[PDB]
Design a protein around this ligand. Structure first.
Ligand SMILES: [Zn+2]
Ligand SMILES: [Zn+2]
Lengths: 191, 223, 92, 149, 105
């Protein structure tokens, strides 16, 4: 089945997350840049040419962490002690409701892994765009779930928190701003 | 001097073993010399030869040419799924059951199995009988249930021995798969025939002194 | 080695708005000239032939001349920053 | 397990699980890591089978030190963990945690240090990280080939 | 190898109870059918010439340091042939640059 990039998904995801589209559009390229240039989209490195580009694996890791946490949310019934974020989400749901969480929440992995493998082998820039597009597609699909009503709130808060965590980690990779170097509890600070 | 293992005497190893009083396990060049009883039968080489073949320690792992650890079971013979590689074992399994109806799969058989394929060349090479293997195994590990197939027929047929574990082996900390691996190690190292601690045996000629009828002390060499 | 490898970028903490000072300097000049000996202290320094070194116990060592560019940058509280820079002449 | 110890001007005596080193540069998915070691997961033959067995065992074995990031799929969290563990001048790894700029400083410093330190002959920049991991997988392949006899 | 479909991570075996289910750290389970039921094996055959030396045996006719013997190649009828001796069994393999392999390899 043929594939094609669509900027609408990133525009909608940027609107939902309230951060500018160039922030998500450059995931994996946060390294060494101020967050101001990230949001303004200044100095965005060109699309990858080689399959050995670290940006491809960075965005793949982002999509992987999203899917991992989503499947943790789906399979809370299995965990003897679930991760803290799904616990914070579902501490007010019974065990039967926790199993219904698995029975209700749709799978979102589709065939991302095989498609990303083929794309990276074939076209690295297309692989980067596909990984960004798939992450945004999954987030908006989760945020667009309407039935059943009780799980809609949980799914929405999870999706917001997870995408925010991904973007927060990406910003955490970016260049630090002007900050006090004394917080590290020692006399010296080296680069 | 020889530096090969099993007969390590290079440098100061043997004098250190003597002087430093290393225990039996620490000795690297342990050699035993045994004389054949009834010194009429001691004079001929061939008899000493297959006596030495008898005395050699033969362990199970040396007789095995393939061993597989399987999560299967033979609770009665209902259907059960096995590994589809070794799935055609049921036809000879039924043959075993009808030919050995004194013993049946015990009620405590666990969901663990070991499929071992015998090296026909070695067991014909050292004259080890299949019945000997099975009776020694079932006498050394009653805690485990062993099933043997017919093997005397010909080439092409692989002598398959299947061994399944019962609960009493798991009765100990550690999981079931480590228990199965431990049992595989235990029965793999079991002794079929011979003497513990003997790695090899060989026949040698010694010059010995014996008294003739007329009080003359002769030095015999054909012993 | 001197130019590429030994770049220094450390920050140290000790007008109350100043929290740390970032010392940055790098050498771009290094040359090793032939061994010299100063004849009567106040001399211009003269060539040191190997046998002179061997007999007097001197070391057949040629002086190393170095020049560096230094950046002393001070980071204040609330992110205010000042940069002090100097071009340091070739010394030895 | 299979552990990787990197010694340099920056690092010293620190023993790290290999998959952690692979995933803090990206490709947190372990299937891609095993692929980088064996060069083909879909391939048949005994060498790939033993390779896969030992690598999976090494991945699942617990570690005394890197347990908190053992199952972490977040590259940033593992980078921050390693920067806390290996960098000097970080004596209380909780005060700087609140300040996002301190975390950014530590993470960026750690990534620059690793770019300079891990397999520098392949490169010393960010764009060479995947090829560094390819070469590391090749090294692990050679080691485990030697263990095969 | 069993990898989790959602997050591509290694999935433990967890031999319970009558069947085998592969469980990930994210909770995904994928069950098991027939071919997943092998735990471990160690076949006894001191032979790796089929794969250990495959590259070496292929490259041998181009290796200038390999020993040659005066025999005719049945395929291309060169009168010289490179001779390989492999392993503890001292298996002798005759190969040629034309692809001839002398029934071994
Ligand atoms: Zn998973
Ligand atoms: Zn030829």
């Amino acid at each position: 089945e043929p594939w094609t990039f669509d900027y609408g998904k990133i525009i909608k995801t940027a609107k939902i997350l309230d951060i500018s589209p160039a922030v998500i559009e450059a995931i994996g390229a946060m390294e060494g840049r101020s967050y101001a240039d990230i949001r303004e989209g200044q100095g965005a490195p060109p699309p990858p040419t080689s399959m050995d580009d670290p940006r491809l694996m960075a965005v793949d890791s982002a999509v992987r962490i999203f899917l991992y946490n989503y499947n943790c949310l789906r399979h809370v019934s299995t965990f003897n002690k679930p991760p803290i974020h799904v616990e914070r989400l579902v501490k007010h749901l019974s065990y039967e409701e926790k199993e219904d969480l698995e029975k209700v929440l749709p799978n979102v992995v589709n065939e991302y892994h095989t498609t990303f493998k083929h794309l990276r082998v074939t076209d690295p820039a297309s692989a980067l765009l596909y990984s960004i597009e798939f992450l945004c597609i999954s987030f908006l699909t989760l945020y667009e779930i309407k039935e059943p009503s009780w799980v809609v709130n949980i799914v929405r808060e999870f999706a917001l928190t997870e995408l925010n965590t991904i973007i927060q980690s990406e910003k955490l990779l970016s260049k630090p701003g002007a900050f006090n170097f004394m917080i590290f509890g020692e006399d010296f600070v080296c680069s | 001097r020889s530096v090969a293992g099993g007969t390590n005497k290079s440098g100061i190893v043997r004098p250190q073993e003597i002087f430093s009083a290393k225990p039996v396990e620490a000795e690297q060049s342990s050699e035993m010399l045994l004389r054949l009883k009834n010194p009429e039968v001691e004079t001929n080489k061939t008899y000493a030869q297959e006596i030495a073949n008898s005395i050699e320690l033969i362990t199970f792992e040396r007789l095995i040419l393939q061993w597989h650890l399987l999560y299967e079971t033979y609770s009665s013979t209902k259907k059960n799924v096995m590994y589809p590689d070794f799935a055609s074992d049921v036809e000879w399994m039924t043959d075993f059951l009808e030919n050995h109806p004194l013993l049946q799969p015990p009620e405590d058989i666990a969901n663990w199995c070991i499929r071992l394929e015998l090296n026909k060349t070695t067991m014909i090479l050292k004259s080890i009988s299949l019945e000997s293997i099975i009776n020694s195994l079932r006498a050394k590990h009653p805690n485990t249930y062993i099933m043997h197939s017919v093997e005397n027929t010909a080439s092409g047929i692989p002598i398959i021995i299947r061994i399944y574990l019962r609960e009493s082996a798991f009765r100990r900390m550690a999981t079931d798969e480590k228990i199965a691996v431990n049992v595989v190690d235990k029965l793999l190292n079991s002794t079929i025939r011979g003497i513990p601690g003997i790695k090899n045996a060989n026949v040698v000629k010694l010059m010995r002194h014996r008294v003739d009828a007329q009080g003359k002390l002769v030095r015999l060499d054909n012993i | 080695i001197v130019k590429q490898m030994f770049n220094v970028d450390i920050t140290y903490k000790d007008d109350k708005l100043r929290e740390s000072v970032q010392i940055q300097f790098n050498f771009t000049d290094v040359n090793i000239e032939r061994p010299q000996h100063r004849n009567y202290s106040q001399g211009n320094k003269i060539n040191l032939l190997p046998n002179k070194a061997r007999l007097c116990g001197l070391s057949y060592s040629g002086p190393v001349n170095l020049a560096a560019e230094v950046i002393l940058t001070a980071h204040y509280s609330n992110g205010r920053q000042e940069v002090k820079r100097a071009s340091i002449p070739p010394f030895q | 397990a299979i552990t990787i110890e990197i010694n340099s001007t920056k690092f010293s005596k620190l023993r790290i699980p290999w998959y952690l080193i692979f995933r803090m540069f990206g490709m947190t998915g372990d299937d891609s890591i095993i692929e980088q070691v064996v060069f083909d997961l879909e391939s048949n033959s005994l060498v790939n089978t033993f390779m896969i067995e030992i690598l999976e065992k090494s991945i699942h074995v617990l570690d005394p030190i890197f347990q908190p990031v053992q199952h972490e799929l977040n590259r940033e969290k593992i980078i921050q963990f390693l920067s806390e563990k290996v960098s000097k001048f970080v004596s209380n790894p909780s005060a700087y945690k609140s300040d996002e700029n301190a975390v950014q400083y530590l993470n960026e410093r750690q990534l620059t240090i690793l770019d300079k330190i891990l397999l520098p002959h392949m490169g010393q920049t960010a764009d060479t990280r995947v090829r560094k991991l390819r070469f590391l997988g090749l090294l692990i392949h050679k080691i485990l080939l030697v263990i095969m006899n | 190898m069993k990898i989790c479909k959602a997050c591509s991570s290694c999935m433990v075996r967890t031999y319970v109870d009558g069947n085998i289910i592969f469980r990930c750290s994210c909770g995904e389970s994928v069950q098991g059918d027939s071919q997943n039921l092998l735990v471990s094996s160690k076949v006894y055959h001191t032979g790796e010439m089929e794969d250990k030396y495959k590259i070496f045996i292929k490259n041998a006719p181009f290796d200038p340091t390999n020993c040659q013997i005066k025999k005719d190649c049945p395929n291309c009828h060169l009168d010289y042939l490179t001779q390989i001796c492999i392993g503890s069994q001292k298996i002798i393999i005759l190969v040629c640059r034309c692809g001839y392999m002398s029934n071994r390899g």
